[PDB]
RNA sequence: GCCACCGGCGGACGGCUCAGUAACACGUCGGUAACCUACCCUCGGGAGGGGGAUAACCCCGGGAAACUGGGGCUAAUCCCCCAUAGGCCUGGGGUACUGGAAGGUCCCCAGGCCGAAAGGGAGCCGUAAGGCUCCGCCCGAGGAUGGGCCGGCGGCCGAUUAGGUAGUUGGUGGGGUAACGGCCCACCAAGCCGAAGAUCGGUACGGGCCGUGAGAGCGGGAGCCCGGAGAUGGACACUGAGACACGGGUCCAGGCCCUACGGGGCGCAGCAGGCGCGAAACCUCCGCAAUGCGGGAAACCGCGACGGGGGGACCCCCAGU
């Protein structure tokens, strides 16, 4: 579809975002969390927005991402499906009590044409 | 001769089991009653009966009352039907046995 | 959902209608059937009041004993004639009367494994 | 000096109503040698070494809302490991203590399993070492406060309701529990209540007490105190010393509400206020000054508990025209 990538530089702790679509939104449509995709092949985006210093063999991997309505991606439920499970911690729940639980709606692991935001970081 | 806190005389034999106050590992503590046996059909258990008088207050007369309980019957003093027994109180032994026989008086008649 | 409260039937045979609900302080847990294996596993529980209970689940050694108070930690082979249950000696479930067959003879268990988390025995005579 | 966030303690008490319950639910006398217990009191002992994330804060957001994602940096009375003290089980052998009576306590051998802590914080004195005293942390023995469990006895109506029970009654060996117990299980038996009313129906929260009568008695147990039970009906678990939790969490059934139609929520038998039902029942008020509770080293802070008024031929006492 179209996505909103959140590129984050772990070596200096600043981030940027860009909007990709068309040919770009087909080469990461089926990728799972922690995949290490090369930047040059996918990325029409350039060595900018950060200061123009990166090498040429850099690549990023998938970390998380929300959904079309606003639900997070729980990196344990494999499959691009949407479920409603009872949580106690972890991505998808903010407890704010002791020993408490709740029934929150989360999304699977594989990217889909429903995901709108994708979170990535740059390993060199 | 061993006593258990009743100032009475022990039985003339020796037992086996541990649910006997005289020879085993049971402790007695509580009420101390006295009645006559009305059945010993099942194993190691009897049924003891005692009678008392209730005093009504409006009519000012009396009235005869009963009480049937169930007691463990150790193998050294095995009591039959129709004889006086002294029984004591202790912890729950089964669903409905909470007393134990300790001494037998007037066996036959 | 193993409720260990009262009964619902009087000693005379009439039924009882419960007047309250089940209190959390009356419940029970699952039988921890001890097996024979090549490595013993055990867990730890938190109990009423904050205490603990060590819970053996598989057995490897035996702690066999004697008449002069001389123990020896030796491993077990299999169970024979558990009088508790009719089909335990076959599946190798050790409860408390089990007749353990150590590698130095026979023995009789004298401890509760599911409560203490150890197996103890006396050297049964022939 | 102000503010939120990590961290500790409290929210299981207090307030409300009487639906269910003929029962060890309640009253009274006893039992636990068959049990748990944070805050608090006394005595006797310990605080020796290592390691680690992540809220606040900074850079990007997603979603209509409820809410929630990715990267960076940081600390503890936060979290985790090692050692030692200690806790638990079983075998063998001594006789030191309590008690009416030791499956308990104490001492000596042996085989195993579990396994602690924050020398942390604030004032002062001396150049500094370093003290002085205030609030603290962990283990053991005992109490106290609060309960769980178990007996003996005592209190309604019905025969146009006579037989009832099959884990039902008991024994042997076990599991489970904080703990005894057919409380559950595997085998062996045939017991157990009953015309002195069992079983099944009916109605009902129990007592201290209250109305009436010269008394014997007959009738009632809304309001105050003490016990029990419930949070729209039925099932079930997490955290904790304690709950299967009225203002905490799931599932079903039955109602209602917001929505950008994809998804979210709520349940006054707390205090005022509203609708419905009925012959039948009040202000959407002011305060933490008093009695007390939770927190804090303390001064203090919060409390529809409690305290002050507003409405009404509620019951008593003392007067006017
Ligand atoms: Mg409450
Ligand atoms: Mg009835
Ligand atoms: Mg973060
Ligand atoms: Mg038994
Ligand atoms: Mg009723
Ligand atoms: Mg009126
Ligand atoms: Zn005897």
Curated annotation (Swiss-Prot), chain A:
One of its GO terms (molecular function) is structural constituent of ribosome. GO terms for biological process: translation. The keyword Ribosomal protein applies. It holds the Pfam family Ribosomal_S6e. Keywords: Ribonucleoprotein, Ribosomal protein. It comes from the Archaea. GO terms for cellular component: ribonucleoprotein complex; ribosome. Signal peptide: none annotated. HAMAP family: Ribosomal_eS6 (MF_00512). PANTHER family: 40S RIBOSOMAL PROTEIN S6. Belongs to the eukaryotic ribosomal protein eS6 family. This is Small ribosomal subunit protein eS6. It comes from Pyrococcus abyssi (strain GE5 / Orsay). The lineage of its organism: Archaea, Methanobacteriati, Methanobacteriota, Thermococci, Thermococcales. The gene is rps6e.
Swiss-Prot record, chain B:
One of the primary rRNA binding proteins, it binds specifically to the 5'-end of 16S ribosomal RNA. GO terms for molecular function: rRNA binding; structural constituent of ribosome. NCBIfam families: PRK08572.1, uS17_arch. Pfam families: Ribosomal_S17. Part of the 30S ribosomal subunit. One of its GO terms (cellular component) is cytosolic small ribosomal subunit. GO terms for biological process: translation. This is Small ribosomal subunit protein uS17.
Curated annotation (Swiss-Prot), chain C:
It comes from the Archaea. Part of the 30S ribosomal subunit. InterPro entries: Ribosomal_eS8, Ribosomal_eS8_CS, Ribosomal_protein_eS8_arc, Ribosomal_Se8/biogenesis_NSA2. GO terms for biological process: translation. GO terms for molecular function: structural constituent of ribosome. This is Small ribosomal subunit protein eS8. GO terms for cellular component: ribonucleoprotein complex; ribosome. Belongs to the eukaryotic ribosomal protein eS8 family. Keywords: Ribonucleoprotein, Ribosomal protein.
């Amino acid at each position: 579809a179209t996505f909103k990538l959140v590129i984050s530089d772990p070596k200096t702790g600043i981030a940027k975002q860009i909007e990709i679509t068309g040919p770009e939104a087909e080469k990461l449509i089926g990728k799972r969390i922690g995949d290490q995709i090369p930047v040059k092949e996918l990325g029409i985006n350039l060595n900018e927005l950060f200061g123009k210093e990166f090498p040429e063999d850099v690549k990023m991997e998938i970390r998380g991402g929300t959904d079309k309505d606003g639900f997070p991606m729980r990196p344990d439920i494999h499959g691009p499906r949407r479920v409603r499970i009872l949580l106690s911690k972890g991505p998808g729940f903010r407890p704010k009590e002791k020993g408490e639980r709740r029934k929150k709606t989360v999304r699977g692991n594989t990217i889909s044409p429903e995901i709108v935001q994708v979170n990535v970081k740059l390993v060199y | 001769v061993r006593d258990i806190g009743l100032r009475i005389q022990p039985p003339a034999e020796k037992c086996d089991d541990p649910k006997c106050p005289w020879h085993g590992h049971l402790k007695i503590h509580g009420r101390v009653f006295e009645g006559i046996v009305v059945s010993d059909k099942p194993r190691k258990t009897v049924t003891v009966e005692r009678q008392y008088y209730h005093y009504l207050k409006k009519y000012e007369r009396y009235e005869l009352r009963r009480s049937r309980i169930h007691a463990h019957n150790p193998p050294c003093i095995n009591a039959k039907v129709g004889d006086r027994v002294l029984i004591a109180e202790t912890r729950p032994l089964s669903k409905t046995k909470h007393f134990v026989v300790v001494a037998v008086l007037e066996r036959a008649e | 959902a193993i409720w260990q409260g009262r009964s619902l039937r009087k000693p005379s045979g009439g039924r009882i209608v419960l007047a309250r609900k089940k209190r959390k302080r009356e419940l029970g847990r699952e039988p921890s059937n001890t097996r024979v294996a090549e490595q013993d596993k055990r867990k730890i529980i938190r109990t009423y009041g904050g205490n603990k209970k060590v819970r053996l689940t598989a057995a490897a050694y035996a702690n066999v004993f004697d008449k002069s108070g001389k123990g020896r930690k030796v491993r077990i082979i299999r169970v024979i004639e558990n009088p508790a249950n009719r089909q335990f000696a076959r599946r190798n479930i050790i409860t408390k009367g089990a007749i353990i067959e150590t590698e130095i003879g026979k023995a009789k268990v004298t401890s509760r494994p599911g409560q203490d988390g150890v197996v103890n025995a006396i050297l049964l005579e022939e």
